[PDB]
């Protein structure tokens, strides 16, 4: 695996060499010689299917650790975990804003990104890893946040919807499905408290800030993008180590930038000086629950609340279960570690209240002719 991964990384710098040539010729100086035609075909037709199947079979080998072995036997070394992380980052940057240049090979690239994401032991890499490898993973989240911010501001009809077309097709086809898979992978393996710590949190906050900002937007593009945005936001909530819906209790959360970093810092990098101001347009948990309850009892149909059903509800359906285990009413093994008060106030009442509202929402739209959101809501609840 070490030699196989090293060759794959060797082809990654080769891949970056001819895509720039393709970008150059597609911009100026058209020429169909294609000096790297052999390299392009080998990368697309051999490497991508090989990466797709190799890491599908040996997914448990790379996710295994000496503390906890998942596969039949053996576990990847730290260097192997570092290389597979750099492979994901280089491949993601390769396809960034170049989905069209891959032609029919773009579905192959994103499928490799999905499988590489499911085989990322990011806990070990971020804890004990080289700065270069860690900086690559941080740059991926930062780049993802910037692309989503450009996407949402274009969905705000700042542009009719140049680079707007490239950014829009890259995010909805490559960035969003991959980011959803990566967050789901982090949530399943409890990597949130180890990966999203200092600058990933800032990147994840901006992604959380921007995605929810579609509530005050009414367009045709936004209507078809809600299922993708909602699923991505739900996975982010499961992996987010901070209770962004309960900023009043953030002082008791160890995995927060406002506790890990000094007040002297957090000013060299732009931060709003208060946890409540990170995403101020997100209603607090108490407010959010009241709004859903009011809509459910009012008998409102799906047409007058598409944002809540497609985005807000999946967020709460994933936020509450995560923080029910870390707050009051949890089954606490906290005889030694019970001194810090819980950073959340989620109890079984919140989950019970939300479930009752969801059931009332469904029956309000029980007899309508078309509702494709019911199947998506069922799996989230």
């Amino acid at each position: 695996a070490f030699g196989f991964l090293q060759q794959l990384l060797r082809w990654m710098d080769i891949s970056q060499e001819f895509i720039a040539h393709l970008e150059a010729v597609v911009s100026s100086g058209r020429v169909e010689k294609s000096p790297h035609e052999q390299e392009i075909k080998f990368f697309a037709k051999i490497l991508l299917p090989l990466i797709n199947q190799y890491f599908t079979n040996h997914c448990l080998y790379f996710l295994s650790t000496p503390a906890k072995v998942l596969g039949s036997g053996g576990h990847a070394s730290n260097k192997e975990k570092e290389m597979i992380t750099s492979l994901f980052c280089k491949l993601a940057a390769l396809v960034r804003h170049r989905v069209s240049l891959f032609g029919t090979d773009a579905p192959a690239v994103v499928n490799c990104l999905h499988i590489l994401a499911r085989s990322l032991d990011a806990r070990t890499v971020m804890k004990s890893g080289p700065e270069i490898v860690k900086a690559g993973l941080r740059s991926f989240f930062e780049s993802a946040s910037e692309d989503i911010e450009k996407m949402v501001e274009n969905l705000r009809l700042g542009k009719v919807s140049k680079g707007v077309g490239q950014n829009l097709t890259y995010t909805t086809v490559a960035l969003l499905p991959v980011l959803t898979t990566l967050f789901q992978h982090i949530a399943q393996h409890q990597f949130g408290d180890d990966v999203i710590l200092d600058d990933v949190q800032v990147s994840c906050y901006r992604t959380l800030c921007s995605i929810y900002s579609l509530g005050t937007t009414k367009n045709t593009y936004v209507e078809k993008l809600r299922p993708a945005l909602g699923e991505c936001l739900a996975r982010l909530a499961a992996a987010m180590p901070v209770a962004f819906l309960e900023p009043q209790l953030n002082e008791y959360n160890a995995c927060s930038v406002y506790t890990t970093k000094s007040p002297r810092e957090r000013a060299i990098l732009g931060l709003p000086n208060s946890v409540e101001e990170m995403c101020p347009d997100i209603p607090v948990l108490d407010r959010l629950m009241a709004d859903i309850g009011g809509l459910a009892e009012s008998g409102a149909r799906y047409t007058e609340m598409p944002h809540v059903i497609e985005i807000t509800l999946p967020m709460l359906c994933s936020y509450l279960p995560r923080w029910w285990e870390r707050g009051p009413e949890a089954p606490p093994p906290a005889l030694p570690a019970g001194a810090p008060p819980p950073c959340t106030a989620v109890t079984s009442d919140h989950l019970n209240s939300l479930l009752g509202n969801i059931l009332r929402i469904i029956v309000n739209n029980l007899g309508i002719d078309e509702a494709t959101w019911m199947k998506r809501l069922a799996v989230f609840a």
Partner: protein, 49 residues
């Protein structure tokens, strides 16, 4: 039974022999169509470690 540490050596050479040769062969659709499954099968048999 299990491999005898010599079949794995043959399998490892078989993988890199095809991989290196295919990396320099000019693109042939027929060759690539059946060489790729061979590499995937070989890679899926060798232990990663």
């Amino acid at each position: 039974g299990v491999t005898s540490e010599e079949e794995l050596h043959l399998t490892r050479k078989l993988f890199w022999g095809i991989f290196d040769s295919l990396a320099h062969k000019k693109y042939d659709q027929e060759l690539y169509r059946m060489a790729m499954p061979c590499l995937c099968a070989i890679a899926g048999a060798l232990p990663p470690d």
